[PDB]
Design an enzyme around this catalytic site. Structure first.
Site, short mmCIF file in Angstrom:
data_model
loop_
_atom_site.label_atom_id
_atom_site.label_comp_id
_atom_site.label_asym_id
_atom_site.label_seq_id
_atom_site.Cartn_x
_atom_site.Cartn_y
_atom_site.Cartn_z
N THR A 159 27.39 -15.78 48.77
CA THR A 159 27.42 -17.05 48.05
C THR A 159 27.66 -16.93 46.55
OG1 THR A 159 26.21 -18.21 49.74
CG2 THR A 159 26.06 -19.11 47.57
N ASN A 180 24.21 -10.94 46.16
CA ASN A 180 23.11 -11.91 45.95
C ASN A 180 21.85 -11.24 45.38
OD1 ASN A 180 24.48 -14.31 46.85
ND2 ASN A 180 23.76 -13.90 48.95
N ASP A 308 33.05 -21.49 49.80
CA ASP A 308 32.81 -20.14 49.26
C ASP A 308 33.12 -18.97 50.25
OD1 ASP A 308 30.43 -20.63 50.78
OD2 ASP A 308 29.11 -20.32 49.10
N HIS A 309 32.85 -19.17 51.52
CA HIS A 309 33.03 -18.11 52.55
C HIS A 309 32.76 -18.76 53.89
CE1 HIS A 309 28.77 -18.34 52.92
NE2 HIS A 309 28.66 -18.05 51.64
N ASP A 683 43.78 6.64 39.56
CA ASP A 683 42.71 5.78 39.15
C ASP A 683 41.37 6.49 39.27
OD1 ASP A 683 41.49 3.48 38.10
OD2 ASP A 683 41.39 2.55 40.12
N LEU A 689 43.13 -0.03 37.43
CA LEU A 689 44.17 -0.03 36.41
C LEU A 689 44.70 1.40 36.22
CD1 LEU A 689 42.43 -2.19 33.59
CD2 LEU A 689 43.95 -3.02 35.39
C1 LIG Z 1 40.39 -8.51 36.11
O1 LIG Z 1 40.48 -9.35 34.94
C2 LIG Z 1 39.63 -8.90 33.89
C3 LIG Z 1 39.70 -9.83 32.67
O2 LIG Z 1 41.01 -9.77 32.12
C4 LIG Z 1 39.97 -7.44 33.50
O3 LIG Z 1 38.84 -7.00 32.77
C5 LIG Z 1 39.09 -6.70 31.40
O4 LIG Z 1 39.78 -5.44 31.24
C6 LIG Z 1 39.87 -4.82 29.94
C7 LIG Z 1 40.24 -3.33 30.14
O5 LIG Z 1 39.38 -2.68 31.13
C8 LIG Z 1 38.55 -4.93 29.16
O6 LIG Z 1 38.81 -4.59 27.79
C9 LIG Z 1 37.79 -3.80 27.11
O7 LIG Z 1 36.79 -4.66 26.52
C10 LIG Z 1 35.87 -4.11 25.55
C11 LIG Z 1 34.98 -5.22 24.95
O8 LIG Z 1 34.66 -6.16 25.98
C12 LIG Z 1 33.66 -7.16 25.66
O9 LIG Z 1 34.22 -8.43 25.24
C13 LIG Z 1 34.87 -9.25 26.23
C14 LIG Z 1 35.40 -10.58 25.62
O10 LIG Z 1 34.46 -11.68 25.61
C15 LIG Z 1 33.95 -9.45 27.46
O11 LIG Z 1 34.64 -10.17 28.49
C16 LIG Z 1 33.40 -8.12 28.02
O12 LIG Z 1 32.52 -8.40 29.15
C17 LIG Z 1 32.16 -7.27 30.00
O13 LIG Z 1 30.93 -6.60 29.65
C18 LIG Z 1 29.72 -7.36 29.82
C19 LIG Z 1 28.54 -6.42 29.58
O14 LIG Z 1 28.75 -5.67 28.39
C20 LIG Z 1 29.58 -7.99 31.21
O15 LIG Z 1 28.51 -8.95 31.23
C21 LIG Z 1 30.88 -8.64 31.69
O16 LIG Z 1 30.74 -9.00 33.08
C22 LIG Z 1 32.05 -7.68 31.48
O17 LIG Z 1 31.81 -6.52 32.33
C23 LIG Z 1 32.99 -5.97 32.98
O18 LIG Z 1 33.90 -5.33 32.06
C24 LIG Z 1 33.37 -4.15 31.39
C25 LIG Z 1 34.38 -3.64 30.36
O19 LIG Z 1 34.36 -4.50 29.20
C26 LIG Z 1 32.95 -3.08 32.43
O20 LIG Z 1 32.40 -1.89 31.82
C27 LIG Z 1 31.97 -3.70 33.45
O21 LIG Z 1 31.74 -2.80 34.52
C28 LIG Z 1 32.50 -5.00 34.07
O22 LIG Z 1 33.55 -4.67 34.99
C29 LIG Z 1 32.74 -7.31 26.89
O23 LIG Z 1 31.50 -7.92 26.51
C30 LIG Z 1 36.64 -3.37 24.46
O24 LIG Z 1 35.68 -2.89 23.50
C31 LIG Z 1 37.51 -2.25 25.08
O25 LIG Z 1 38.18 -1.41 24.07
C32 LIG Z 1 38.20 0.06 24.26
O26 LIG Z 1 39.43 0.50 24.89
C33 LIG Z 1 40.56 0.47 24.00
C34 LIG Z 1 41.90 0.50 24.74
O27 LIG Z 1 42.75 -0.54 24.23
C35 LIG Z 1 40.39 1.61 22.98
O28 LIG Z 1 41.56 1.74 22.14
C36 LIG Z 1 39.16 1.30 22.12
O29 LIG Z 1 38.91 2.48 21.32
C37 LIG Z 1 37.92 0.88 22.95
O30 LIG Z 1 37.21 2.12 23.24
C38 LIG Z 1 35.90 2.33 22.62
O31 LIG Z 1 34.83 2.00 23.53
C39 LIG Z 1 34.77 2.84 24.70
C40 LIG Z 1 33.78 2.25 25.71
O32 LIG Z 1 32.44 2.42 25.25
C41 LIG Z 1 34.45 4.27 24.24
O33 LIG Z 1 34.24 5.15 25.36
C42 LIG Z 1 35.58 4.77 23.32
O34 LIG Z 1 35.38 6.17 22.96
C43 LIG Z 1 35.72 3.78 22.13
O35 LIG Z 1 34.59 3.79 21.25
C44 LIG Z 1 38.50 -2.92 26.08
O36 LIG Z 1 39.47 -3.78 25.44
C45 LIG Z 1 37.90 -6.32 29.27
O37 LIG Z 1 36.62 -6.35 28.64
C46 LIG Z 1 37.71 -6.71 30.73
N1 LIG Z 1 37.12 -8.04 30.86
C47 LIG Z 1 36.21 -8.44 31.77
C48 LIG Z 1 35.79 -9.89 31.69
O38 LIG Z 1 35.71 -7.72 32.64
C49 LIG Z 1 40.15 -6.53 34.70
O39 LIG Z 1 40.75 -5.32 34.26
C50 LIG Z 1 41.00 -7.16 35.81
N2 LIG Z 1 40.98 -6.28 36.98
C51 LIG Z 1 42.13 -5.83 37.51
C52 LIG Z 1 42.02 -4.92 38.71
O40 LIG Z 1 43.23 -6.15 37.09
CA LIG Z 2 27.54 -19.36 50.41
CA LIG Z 3 42.07 3.61 35.92
CL LIG Z 4 24.03 -8.49 48.27
ZN LIG Z 5 24.68 -18.08 53.63
#
Ligand SMILES: *[C@@H]1O[C@H](CO)[C@@H](O[C@@H]2O[C@H](CO)[C@@H](O[C@@H]3O[C@H](CO[C@H]4O[C@H](CO)[C@@H](O)[C@H](O[C@H]5O[C@H](CO)[C@@H](O)[C@H](O)[C@@H]5O[C@H]5O[C@H](CO)[C@@H](O)[C@H](O)[C@@H]5O)[C@@H]4O)[C@@H](O)[C@H](O[C@H]4O[C@H](CO)[C@@H](O)[C@H](O)[C@@H]4O[C@H]4O[C@H](CO)[C@@H](O)[C@H](O)[C@@H]4O)[C@@H]3O)[C@H](O)[C@H]2NC(C)=O)[C@H](O)[C@H]1NC(C)=O
Ligand SMILES: [Ca+2]
Ligand SMILES: [Ca+2]
Ligand SMILES: [Cl-]
Ligand SMILES: [Zn+2]
Ligand SMILES: NS(=O)(=O)C1CCN(C(=O)N2CC3=C(CN(C(=O)c4cc(OCC5CCOCC5)nc(C5CC5)c4)C3)C2)CC1
Ligand SMILES: [K+]
Ligand code: NA
Length: 805
Positions: A159, A180, A308-309, A683, A689
């Site tokens: 859900t 969930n 939803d499902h 990957d 990615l």
């Molecule tokens: C599906 O669609 C989504 C959305 O488009 C795709 O996800 C995006 O992909 C991007 C690349 O992976 C990613 O970009 C990175 O974001 C970093 C900052 O992000 C914050 O800000 C945004 C904007 O509001 C926010 O959405 C983010 O939210 C995540 O994190 C919070 C918790 O902190 C969670 O509550 C939330 O659910 C979300 O989590 C998810 O994403 C994170 C990654 O951000 C995962 O770790 C989680 O597991 C979860 O999946 C953030 O709050 C930004 O700082 C990154 O920049 C680094 O990389 C660049 C490359 O250009 C590099 O040059 C820089 O140096 C930098 O590196 C530095 O930091 C590193 C990490 O610590 C460190 O190791 C280095 O040495 C450096 O110091 C980067 O731009 C984007 O955030 C996510 N967005 C979301 C919403 O998830 C997804 O890819 C798609 N999927 C497919 C299959 O296509």
């Molecule tokens: Ca449901």
């Molecule tokens: Ca990868």
């Molecule tokens: Cl679950």
């Molecule tokens: Zn149910």
């Protein structure tokens, strides 16, 4: 603390949530134990029920009534939904013939058609047919509007992950609601169905529709309803909000029903007890539509009916227990039910080993109803890995089953006959989509699509720019009459080189050999022509893939195939070839079994070498263009070029050889030719990615040859199979896969048998969208077709699922 001594007078279902310690009057106050003292009296009136009767028509306004039948009710916005029918001779919306809504027909002061999203929990796709006799309102929306025969949820088919995917366009791994129940080891906190932790904002990533709307100045009704607010009141509250003045009135609304999920868990998806809940949902839909008709909004509002499902038959007796496999069952924590997630009970236990847990759960019983995976080995189509809240060890549970730790978990908690959560391609998990309104199409059926795509469309329907998400914006344009989003193809970033013959044989020291020293002007110009691309139109049908990142690569032409060869990864990014219905399969001749040939267009320095494979005792090699499908003996030598070789574990070569020797020809025979594009995927951080070079964790020993995590194929043909793949005048048909490149076949329990008994079943499990491959490769496919770009986007999101009807 809440100072509950304030009042809801004039504030019932207020849109702006007031902050503690002040008392609340919004549709969630119950769920936070924060409503003002008088909220029930003022805001949850029930007197005289929900329907006007003859005797109430024209009544004196009594403010105690749940809804009104007095003459002033239309202007106050608070008539019972049937008021006009009972008291003014009007017909119910459902009884009216359906009439095309060519333009929005809205009252003055409406800037845009409002959107109302009506979500139904557990509404399995087959309910639209099997329940159709008892859902007349829903069936009218469905047949008069735009509908899919089903909509694919996200995994897990639970859900909260699905509702928040609907809200965000994101995969659960990205939005963070990965089940969930969850544990976040960074927070050191747990998320549950019951209790207060789930309200903390830090669980919820991305940007949901109501925030996207609010940031861009579109007003949103509060989407969430406390469970004790009855459905009739939810609807009346929506309709009241719709009578607010223009500057106060929301443009987007949400209604959520707990049914039919609630009953489905108790009675099974098709229990006789399920007819009534379906009736009651339909009646609620009727209320909303009659209510919109009263407000003259029924040809103005876009309505989405969405689930939803689905729901599957599941009983307590169909439970697998981990205590029947693991010796150490008290050293683990299991998240149980229709999926399994395993982690160590104690972080201080250094004797925890995932590898021994996986081995103890792998193919241990002949009928085993679950399969363990390290999360990175799950089918990539599930996109279920890249979150710290998803445990390394995962169990995919067979439909109709549960997993639990110990039998005591099942009886010290049979009750239930239905559940969901299984693999999102399972038929019983599929759910529903209907769009009805001025912006949706009239009497239009659309193909099944994924719920990740809806956020973009909901944004389109409201004039909003979607936040970045996992939809493919434009892939659902065919649902809409207007407000389409007209995307352009992404720009190619790296242009290829087109190398000619540049190196002599003896410049290579690759440790390879081939028995190819066998010598004609007629055919000499012909082979020159082939190396310059004279057959490229045959083998590259949809243009070359565009490379969307900065790299160095070469186009290599051959009689039977074309490739884009990466000088950085030392192998093709893609290899493209067409196999007609008439093509013949041949063997690898005895003399050429270990043949590998230097490619005189590509430098030694940018070439693989045979010596590395010789010394790497774990790693062997395969070819992307299959030597089995060579068009002639002479052409077959092209297939043994070092530029067509890729690293493959012996275990994986069993899969690959069978695909190339048997299945490509089978597909060509069945589909009247196929075009195949195959290649490697890297990957290592399991984020869906393309890896950069510095993310690669494994090389062929002693070399810079990177080891792919997966191999893909995109198999395209003419949708009208009367036309051959290579002369198709219309729409295309595609299936694709992303096979894990693994050193064993432990995933396939029948892998000791002949490949004909297990390989295709593996491949089916790892079916994929072209879009999934695009993300994983940085390539953009189908750049040069005769088809519209939105149709191509639709094609790229297609998933070939291999379920029956
Ligand atoms: C599906 O669609 C989504 C959305 O488009 C795709 O996800 C995006 O992909 C991007 C690349 O992976 C990613 O970009 C990175 O974001 C970093 C900052 O992000 C914050 O800000 C945004 C904007 O509001 C926010 O959405 C983010 O939210 C995540 O994190 C919070 C918790 O902190 C969670 O509550 C939330 O659910 C979300 O989590 C998810 O994403 C994170 C990654 O951000 C995962 O770790 C989680 O597991 C979860 O999946 C953030 O709050 C930004 O700082 C990154 O920049 C680094 O990389 C660049 C490359 O250009 C590099 O040059 C820089 O140096 C930098 O590196 C530095 O930091 C590193 C990490 O610590 C460190 O190791 C280095 O040495 C450096 O110091 C980067 O731009 C984007 O955030 C996510 N967005 C979301 C919403 O998830 C997804 O890819 C798609 N999927 C497919 C299959 O296509
Ligand atoms: Ca449901
Ligand atoms: Ca990868
Ligand atoms: Cl679950
Ligand atoms: Zn149910
Ligand atoms: N979990 S279970 O066993 O299946 C069972 C447990 C008992 N379960 C149960 O009692 N409930 C579950 C439940 C409620 C009330 N809820 C909401 O109001 C809600 C509606 C909603 O909408 C999103 C729309 C976006 C656009 O697209 C349309 C959707 N998003 C959410 C959360 C994702 C933020 C909640 C969710 C009560 C019902 C489910
Ligand atoms: K080897
Ligand atoms: Na096996």
């Amino acid at each position: 603390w809440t100072a509950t001594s304030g009042s809801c007078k004039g504030r019932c279902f207020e849109l702006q949530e007031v902050g503690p310690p002040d008392c609340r009057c919004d549709n969630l106050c119950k769920s936070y134990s924060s409503c003002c003292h008088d909220f029930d009296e003022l805001c949850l009136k029930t007197a005289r029920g929900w329907e006007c009767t003859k005797d109430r028509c024209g009544e004196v306004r009594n403010e105690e009534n749940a809804c009104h039948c007095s003459e002033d009710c239309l202007s106050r916005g608070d008539c019972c939904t049937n008021y006009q029918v009972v008291c003014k001779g009007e017909s119910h919306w459902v009884d009216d013939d359906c009439e095309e809504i060519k333009v929005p027909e809205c009252p003055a002061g409406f800037v845009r058609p409002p959107l109302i999203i009506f979500s139904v929990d557990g509404f399995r796709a087959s309910y639209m047919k099997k329940g159709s006799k008892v859902m007349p309102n829903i069936e009218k929306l469905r047949s008069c509007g735009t509908h899919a025969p089903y909509m694919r949820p996200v995994y897990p088919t639970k859900t909260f992950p699905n509702l928040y995917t609907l809200a965000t366009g994101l995969y659960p791994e990205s939005h963070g609601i990965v089940g969930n129940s969850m544990y976040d080891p960074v927070f050191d906190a747990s998320f549950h169905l019951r209790g207060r932790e789930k309200f903390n904002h830090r669980w919820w990533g991305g940007q949901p529709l109501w925030i996207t709307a609010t940031k861009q100045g579109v007003r949103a009704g509060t989407f969430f309803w406390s469970v004790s607010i009855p459905h009739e009141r939810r609807i009346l509250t929506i309709l009241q909000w719709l009578s607010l003045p223009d500057n106060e009135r929301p443009s987007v609304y949400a209604f959520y029903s707990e049914q039919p999920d609630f009953s489905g868990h108790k009675y099974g998806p098709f229990g006789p007890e399920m007819t009534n809940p379906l009736r009651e949902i339909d009646k609620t839909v009727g209320q909303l539509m009659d209510g919109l008709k009263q407000l003259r909004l029924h040809r103005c509002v876009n309505v989405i009916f969405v689930g939803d499902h689905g729901m599957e038959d599941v009983t307590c007796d169909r439970t697998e227990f981990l205590s029947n496999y693991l010796t150490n069952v008290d050293d683990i924590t299991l998240v149980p039910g229709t999926l399994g997630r395993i982690r160590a009970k104690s972080i201080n236990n250094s004797k925890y080993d995932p590898k021994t847990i996986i081995a103890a759960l792998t193919c241990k019983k002949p009928d085993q109803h679950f399969k363990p995976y390290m999360k990175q080995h799950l089918p990539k189509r599930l996109h279920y890995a890249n979150n710290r809240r998803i445990e390394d060890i995962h169990l995919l549970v067979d439909r109709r089953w549960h997993v639990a730790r110990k039998p005591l978990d099942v009886y010290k908690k049979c009750f239930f006959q239905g559940d969901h959560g299984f693999d999102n391609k399972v038929n019983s998990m599929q759910t529903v989509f209907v769009g009805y309104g001025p912006t949706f199409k009239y009497r239009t059926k659309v193909p099944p699509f994924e719920n990740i795509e809806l956020y973009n469309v909901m944004c389109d329907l409201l004039g909003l720019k979607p936040a970045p998400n996992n939809g493919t914006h434009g892939s659902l344009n065919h649902l809409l009459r207007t407000n389409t989003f007209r995307p352009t193809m992404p720009d190619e970033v790296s242009r290829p080189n087109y190398p000619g013959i540049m190196y002599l044989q003896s410049e290579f020291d690759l440790g390879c050999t081939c028995d190819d020293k066998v010598e004609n002007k007629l055919e000499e110009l012909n082979k020159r022509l082939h190396t310059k691309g004279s057959t490229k139109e045959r083998h590259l049908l949809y243009g070359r893939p565009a490379v969307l990142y900065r790299t160095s690569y070469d186009i290599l032409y051959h009689t039977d195939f074309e490739s884009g060869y990466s000088e950085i990864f030392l192998m093709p990014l893609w290899t493209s070839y067409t196999i007609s219905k008439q093509a013949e399969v041949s063997s690898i001749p005895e003399h050429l079994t270990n043949c590998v040939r230097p490619d005189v267009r590509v430098s030694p320095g940018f070439s693989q070498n045979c010596l590395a494979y010789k010394n790497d005792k774990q790693m062997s090699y395969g070819f992307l263009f299959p030597p089995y499908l060579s068009s002639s003996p002479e052409a077959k030598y092209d297939a043994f070029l070092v530029t067509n070789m890729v690293p493959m574990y012996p275990a994986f070569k069993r899969v690959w050889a069978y695909f190339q020797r048997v299945l490509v020809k089978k597909y060509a025979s069945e589909r009247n030719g196929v075009n195949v594009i195959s290649g490697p995927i890297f990957d290592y951080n399991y984020d869906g990615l393309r890896d950069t070079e510095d993310e690669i964790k494994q090389y062929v020993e002693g070399s810079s040859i990177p080891v792919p995590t997966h191999y893909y194929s995109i198999i395209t043909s003419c949708l009208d199979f009367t036309q051959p793949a290579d002369k198709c005048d219309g729409p295309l048909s595609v299936s694709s896969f992303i096979l894990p490149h693994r050193p064993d076949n432990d995933e396939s329990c029948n892998s000791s048998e002949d490949e004909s008994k297990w390989v295709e079943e593996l491949m089916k499990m790892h079916t994929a969208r072209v879009r999934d491959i695009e993300h994983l490769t940085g390539l953009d496919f189908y750049r040069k077709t005769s088809r519209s770009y939105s149709e191509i986007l639709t094609l790229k999101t297609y998933l070939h699922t291999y379920e029956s009807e």
